[PDB]
Design a protein around this nucleic acid. Structure first.
Length: 403
RNA sequence: GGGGGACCACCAGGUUGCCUAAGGAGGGGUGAACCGGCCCAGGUCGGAAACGGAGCAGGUCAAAACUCCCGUGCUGAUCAGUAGUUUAGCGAGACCCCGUCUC
């Protein structure tokens, strides 16, 4: 979210000036290239983007009569497309039946986190996922995967110390082909801080099973050293994809994105932190756009809050829409405003059908002050917080019936 | 957490009356608004945890209080007028005819 501010500052530097000449475009691209280099992005490819922008739109030829800065922002957006993502969306849905997808990461790339949290989105969309943990050389990560996975009702077939990921993955697939499942995600192990050594075993697994998709997990902390690895990743398996993880902990994600774009592949999923909810599919060009340029009852409010928290996760889509304004994007590192909503929902759950189905619950609570005091017995929140909720509901209903 | 006393309200259920014009050891419901108990999701408090406390939704009633019905005794009142019994006459009159007389 820093690169968008740095290029929005470059757009504000284009605006509010009465110059327009080649020097302003030069000084703006001098600030754009500085922002890309401070991300990580390679000065050769950035100067290639710059000379492509100049060869596309010079200012020596006269397209006489022209609204400016709009097609300039569009050309900068277009060249940042023609480098970050190769175009239209990478194919996210569930690819037919039984969906055998392989995952190979790196040591320290949050293999357990990615392989745990990718299943929740397909389970919420309505697709049955099954994880085969062939992480044979990580006995502790077996226990972390099981402790994080038993809260999600997922079957598991895999034992300890068989030393054969081929046999473990094959017996996993042939046992999850029993109850007619749909997605089979196979999580393979780590070795040697992988030089050239696990790809032989992964070719053995692929020759044994013949999977459908192969997705490799990459980090944002590596930066411009992703290229030599990605050459091997895209020469050994052609039909394969990337998941770039760990964005909020580093300032070097754009360099990894530029390395993947220079090695010419589309990216399906992306990770944005350590929490469960920090994964997003790719809406490629609108990600770059959102980055650069931005009778009502108590039961009715409770059900609308149910619908809003049902549209809950969704934060990179719902929070980056034009028309919001400045002074946001942190709100105290984004946690408590989503957390207190469930608390207010339980304060509303401390009400009965009469209070929730009456016409004006604030008027009913003003007529009967013991109804305010009855919420505090079962919600356990303070009566002051109940009264603050009722004043917020009163102002809310006033803004609704005036709205 | 382990134990010794003292007091209040009630229930089951066995004997009962210095008790009634009658006083069921009946059934049901709310148990709300903080004022009965139990199980207590989520949450909160204490704790490093195990776990435990106050306990909300929700469910529950042999045992806080309230209320309804049946039975009960007093008590007005309604219904069918059911029940088993209680003109005529007289005296005068015009003209004509018949005789007499005179000129």
């Amino acid at each position: 979210a820093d690169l968008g501010r740095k290029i929005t500052s470059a757009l504000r530097s284009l605006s509010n000036a009465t110059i327009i000449n080649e020097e302003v475009l030069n000084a703006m691209l001098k600030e754009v290239c500085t922002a890309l280099l401070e991300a990580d992005v390679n000065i050769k490819l950035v100067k290639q983007l710059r000379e492509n922008v100049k060869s596309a739109i010079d200012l020596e030829e006269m397209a006489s009569g022209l609204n400016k800065r709009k097609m300039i922002q569009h050309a900068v957006f277009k060249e940042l497309v023609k480098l970050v993502d190769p175009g239209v969306k990478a194919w996210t849905p569930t690819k037919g039946k039984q969906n055998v997808i392989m995952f190979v990461g790196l040591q320290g790339s949050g293999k357990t986190t990615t392989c745990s949290k990718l299943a929740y989105y397909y389970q919420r969309k309505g697709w049955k996922t099954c994880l085969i943990c062939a992480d044979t050389f990580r006995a502790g990560a077996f226990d972390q995967l099981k402790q994080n996975a038993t809260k999600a009702r997922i079957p598991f077939y895999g034992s300890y110390t068989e030393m054969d990921p081929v046999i473990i993955a094959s017996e996993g697939v042939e046992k999850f082909k029993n109850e007619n499942f749909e997605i089979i995600i196979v999580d393979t192990s780590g070795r040697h801080k992988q030089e050239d050594s696990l790809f032989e075993e992964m070719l053995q697994v692929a020759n044994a099973i013949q999977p459908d998709n192969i997705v490799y997990v990459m980090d944002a902390s590596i930066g411009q050293a992703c290229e030599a690895q990605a050459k091997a990743f895209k020469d050994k398996v052609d039909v394969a994809s990337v998941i770039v993880t760990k964005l909020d902990g580093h300032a070097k994600g754009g360099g990894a994105l530029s390395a993947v774009a220079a090695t010419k592949s589309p990216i399906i999923f992306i990770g944005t932190g350590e929490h469960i909810d920090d994964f997003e599919p790719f809406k490629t060009q609108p990600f770059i756009s959102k980055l650069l340029g931005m009778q009502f009852t108590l039961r009715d409010m409770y059900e609308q809050f149910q619908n809003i928290m049902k549209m809950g996760p969704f934060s990179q889509i719902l929070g980056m829409i034009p028309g919001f304004g400045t002074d946001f994007m942190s709100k105290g590192n984004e946690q408590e405003s989503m957390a207190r909503l469930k608390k207010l929902m339980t304060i509303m759950d401390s009400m009965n059908d009469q209070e929730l189905d009456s016409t004006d619950g604030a008027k009913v609570f003003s007529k009967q002050p013991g109804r305010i005091q009855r919420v505090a017995r079962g919600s356990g929140v303070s009566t002051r917080d109940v009264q603050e909720l009722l004043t917020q509901y009163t102002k809310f209903a006033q803004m609704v019936k005036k709205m």
